Design a protein around this ligand. Sequence first.
Ligand SMILES: *[C@@H]1O[C@H](CO)[C@@H](O[C@@H]2O[C@H](CO)[C@@H](O[C@@H]3O[C@H](CO)[C@@H](O)[C@H](O[C@H]4O[C@H](CO)[C@@H](O)[C@H](O)[C@@H]4O)[C@@H]3O)[C@H](O)[C@H]2NC(C)=O)[C@H](O)[C@H]1NC(C)=O
Ligand SMILES: *[C@@H]1O[C@H](CO)[C@@H](O[C@@H]2O[C@H](CO)[C@@H](O[C@@H]3O[C@H](CO)[C@@H](O)[C@H](O[C@H]4O[C@H](CO)[C@@H](O)[C@H](O)[C@@H]4O)[C@@H]3O)[C@H](O)[C@H]2NC(C)=O)[C@H](O)[C@H]1NC(C)=O
Ligand SMILES: *[C@@H]1O[C@H](CO)[C@@H](O[C@@H]2O[C@H](CO)[C@@H](O[C@@H]3O[C@H](CO)[C@@H](O)[C@H](O[C@H]4O[C@H](CO)[C@@H](O)[C@H](O)[C@@H]4O)[C@@H]3O)[C@H](O)[C@H]2NC(C)=O)[C@H](O)[C@H]1NC(C)=O
Ligand SMILES: CC(C)[C@H](C)[C@@H](O)[C@H](O)[C@@H](C)[C@H]1CC[C@H]2[C@@H]3COC(=O)[C@H]4C[C@H](O)[C@H](O)C[C@]4(C)[C@H]3CC[C@]12C
Ligand SMILES: *[C@@H]1O[C@H](CO)[C@@H](O)[C@H](O)[C@H]1NC(C)=O
Ligand SMILES: *[C@@H]1O[C@H](CO)[C@@H](O)[C@H](O)[C@H]1NC(C)=O
Ligand SMILES: *[C@@H]1O[C@H](CO)[C@@H](O)[C@H](O)[C@H]1NC(C)=O
Ligand SMILES: *[C@@H]1O[C@H](CO)[C@@H](O)[C@H](O)[C@H]1NC(C)=O
Length: 743
Amino acid sequence: SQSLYREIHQLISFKDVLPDKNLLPDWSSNKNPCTFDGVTCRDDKVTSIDLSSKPLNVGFSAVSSSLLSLTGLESLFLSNSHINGSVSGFKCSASLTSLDLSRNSLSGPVTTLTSLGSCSGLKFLNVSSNTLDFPGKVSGGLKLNSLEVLDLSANSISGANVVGWVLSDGCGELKHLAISGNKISGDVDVSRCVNLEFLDVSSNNFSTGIPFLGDCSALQHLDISGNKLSGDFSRAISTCTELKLLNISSNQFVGPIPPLPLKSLQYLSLAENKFTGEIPDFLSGACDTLTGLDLSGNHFYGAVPPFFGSCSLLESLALSSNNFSGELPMDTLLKMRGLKVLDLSFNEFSGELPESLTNLSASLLTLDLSSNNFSGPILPNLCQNPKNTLQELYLQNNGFTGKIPPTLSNCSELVSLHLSFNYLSGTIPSSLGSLSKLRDLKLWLNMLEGEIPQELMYVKTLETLILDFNDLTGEIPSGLSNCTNLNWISLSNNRLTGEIPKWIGRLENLAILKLSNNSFSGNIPAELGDCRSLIWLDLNTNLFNGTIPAAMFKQSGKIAANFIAGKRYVYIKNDGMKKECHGAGNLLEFQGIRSEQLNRLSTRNPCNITSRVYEGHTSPTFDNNGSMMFLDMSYNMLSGYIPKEIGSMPYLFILNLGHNDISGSIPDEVGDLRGLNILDLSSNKLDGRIPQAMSALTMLTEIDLSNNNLSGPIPEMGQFETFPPAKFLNNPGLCGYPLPRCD
Ligand SMILES: *[C@@H]1O[C@H](CO)[C@@H](O[C@@H]2O[C@H](CO)[C@@H](O[C@@H]3O[C@H](CO)[C@@H](O)[C@H](O[C@H]4O[C@H](CO)[C@@H](O)[C@H](O)[C@@H]4O)[C@@H]3O)[C@H](O)[C@H]2NC(C)=O)[C@H](O)[C@H]1NC(C)=O
Ligand SMILES: *[C@@H]1O[C@H](CO)[C@@H](O[C@@H]2O[C@H](CO)[C@@H](O[C@@H]3O[C@H](CO)[C@@H](O)[C@H](O[C@H]4O[C@H](CO)[C@@H](O)[C@H](O)[C@@H]4O)[C@@H]3O)[C@H](O)[C@H]2NC(C)=O)[C@H](O)[C@H]1NC(C)=O
Ligand SMILES: *[C@@H]1O[C@H](CO)[C@@H](O[C@@H]2O[C@H](CO)[C@@H](O[C@@H]3O[C@H](CO)[C@@H](O)[C@H](O[C@H]4O[C@H](CO)[C@@H](O)[C@H](O)[C@@H]4O)[C@@H]3O)[C@H](O)[C@H]2NC(C)=O)[C@H](O)[C@H]1NC(C)=O
Ligand SMILES: CC(C)[C@H](C)[C@@H](O)[C@H](O)[C@@H](C)[C@H]1CC[C@H]2[C@@H]3COC(=O)[C@H]4C[C@H](O)[C@H](O)C[C@]4(C)[C@H]3CC[C@]12C
Ligand SMILES: *[C@@H]1O[C@H](CO)[C@@H](O)[C@H](O)[C@H]1NC(C)=O
Ligand SMILES: *[C@@H]1O[C@H](CO)[C@@H](O)[C@H](O)[C@H]1NC(C)=O
Ligand SMILES: *[C@@H]1O[C@H](CO)[C@@H](O)[C@H](O)[C@H]1NC(C)=O
Ligand SMILES: *[C@@H]1O[C@H](CO)[C@@H](O)[C@H](O)[C@H]1NC(C)=O
């Protein structure tokens, strides 16, 4: 057959235009393509090709001429294959059914896809996650009316009535339409698409009309979430009898929960809206089929109605961030056999934990009661039932008292324990080290005393250890060296003593290290510069002495921070008003806690919290090849001179070496820190002239060189003219504006 001779030559030609050789090493001439990797054959004839997740790095023109023209080819999967360029006219095999070009660098107007109409048998098309757009006026049509499945999601499409453009030539055969994650706005009319089952217009710019669904005869999945929609969606979906999933979350809908089609409903999300009232009784109509419910981020109140006990298929119930009050409805919750996730966080649920809660320790994967008015002791009988399935236990930001039950070790599947922000006293039970799967241990802001258990070394999966603001004494356990997956360690505000161990450098995943307000002594380890992930170091208010090692900045430029991202935090800026407040600012973990309860720190901290709070999710300014972003060693007994290597950290935002015994002169390399915002070298024995090179710093919003032996003229260029005289005071030999003219 000529087609067989043609098949092999086209495949090999495609291999040869690949910039990277050896990418398809088993592809070779004078061999049967059915033996090639990525190829699928039926009766010794290629029917499908899959080169997904291979960095092909070639233009679409290569694909179209070599691959899409192959006789008998039924499907082609090139997802995440690093293909760029634009789609354009080409001869397409009439047998081609599915084409996946998702997650690539395809560019140009979305009108380029119309040329795929040369594929007569095309039915499935995935061009999601590319850079396709819609320049200027929207006119004409996509003109692919034979498609059953189309995914234009996560592109750069921006325009009004782009959906109408897609459906202009007809949607009679269309079963699945996803256009999510764009900037499309205007009207959505799928009433002519009588076989439509899946519709996702989420994360767009729709601010006016709700999609018109017509008879809505075949619709099962409807996602309009992540828009600016308001109005009466109830009436719009009222005719949809086959509806299974309804996601209207993150919109501007108001009022009480309206009527919904419940008979086939599996998933329902009303989350992140302006809905009010209490959970109506009529929702019991979904209890036969309802798998998941999310009412979070609204103004709902009252108590969880009793009818929920009839929903035995409900796997997930999220009522977080509302005004639900009363005690824990253990009556209804025990009637739900299939519930694996309970989230009542950020509510006003009050009272002590009922003893029947222990029954859900063998059922629930996630129990989140964080930020509530719960009081009394933590149930010691928690996880009494054998084979406990509990993974996440969030009890933070409550009125819990007493001791941490050592019995919590009986929950062996626990990956996250958050007991922070409570009135818990006693010590940390050493049995917690017996948790082989534990990743996050957060107990901060409690009255916990004693020492940090040495037995924690038996947790090789440990990632975050947050013990801030307790009465913890003793030294850092030598066994923590065995936890190599540690990224976030914060032991600040305790009475901890000893030194930073030399094995600290052996933690290659360590990103944040905060030891402030302790009695830590000794010298700063040179092995701190063996940490490849460290971007945040806060050692302020300790007994550290000796000279700053130059080697600690050795990884500068090599730093890689990845796993640290995505974690919720508060950063409380230091108000320079009060002398009792130390450090540049307080970085603290803040998952599942209200900023409104930050006043609980008032008794434990001298700093004023008023208008100095920054809240977000950890977001490094780089991925690989970065540097330390934060460095604070202020209020210590550090001596010697600042090493010139200090200026090797271009991503450093803040540098506070204030209140030390550091001598010498400010190195000229400080002027190479081009990302620097704050620079506090005040209250030291620094002498000499301020290096003119510091005039190159364009990002400084704050500086303090006061209380030093600095002399000579202040640099006249740069940002020095911006800063007030107060920042240079108590420097006898220092002159020039903002100070008086030199003599
Ligand atoms: C068009 O292409 C896009 C891009 O691929 C595609 O979106 C992606 O769909 C896949 C599913 O095929 C998603 O991947 C899943 O992610 C969830 C978590 O959200 C995982 O739990 C899933 O794991 C399953 O699959 C794995 C192997 O694939 C198994 O190892 C595992 O045990 C589970 O069985 C699954 O990986 C992905 O998140 C999205 N988004 C992306 C990739 O950006 C879209 O679906 C395509 N359109 C159509 C109509 O198919
Ligand atoms: C019900 O609907 C809600 C709301 O839509 C939904 O929660 C959302 O899930 C989506 C996942 O599909 C989230 O989308 C991502 O969010 C992250 C976090 O910020 C972003 O970084 C992501 O950005 C990428 O994707 C964009 C395209 O969407 C790209 O333009 C961008 O460059 C990135 O590649 C992405 O937006 C979304 O954040 C949440 N929203 C909320 C409020 O939780 C929920 O999953 C739905 N539930 C069901 C069962 O369908
Ligand atoms: C390092 O950690 C130690 C130990 O936590 C810490 O010492 C604490 O400092 C706070 C900050 O002031 C002290 O809090 C005080 O406690 C007394 C009770 O003895 C309160 O009466 C005080 O209340 C004042 O503030 C209230 C509102 O904020 C007012 O209503 C009231 O009238 C007072 O003005 C005050 O809060 C705490 O007592 C000490 N504890 C100990 C054991 O020393 C230290 O500050 C930390 N160091 C650094 C640099 O952070
Ligand atoms: C990488 C993470 C651990 C880190 C928290 C990161 O997520 C977060 O964005 C950090 C970089 C933020 C949190 C607080 C921010 C600072 C907030 O408070 C600071 O005083 C302001 C003051 C001034 O505005 C400076 O221009 C920025 C500056 C100095 C910000 C520098 C960057 C931050 C320090
Ligand atoms: C496609 O990617 C290659 C590889 O970098 C590049 O040389 C080429 O210019 C790109 N084409 C377009 C149209 O951007
Ligand atoms: C959303 O739509 C409005 C109205 O057409 C428009 O003014 C606005 O620019 C759009 N937003 C984006 C991000 O394109
Ligand atoms: C939340 O509910 C409680 C219950 O009594 C009520 O006192 C409080 O005012 C409610 N919150 C708001 C903002 O109305
Ligand atoms: C630092 O303090 C320790 C005692 O805590 C002392 O032995 C050591 O000599 C000091 N370092 C310097 C450089 O003086």
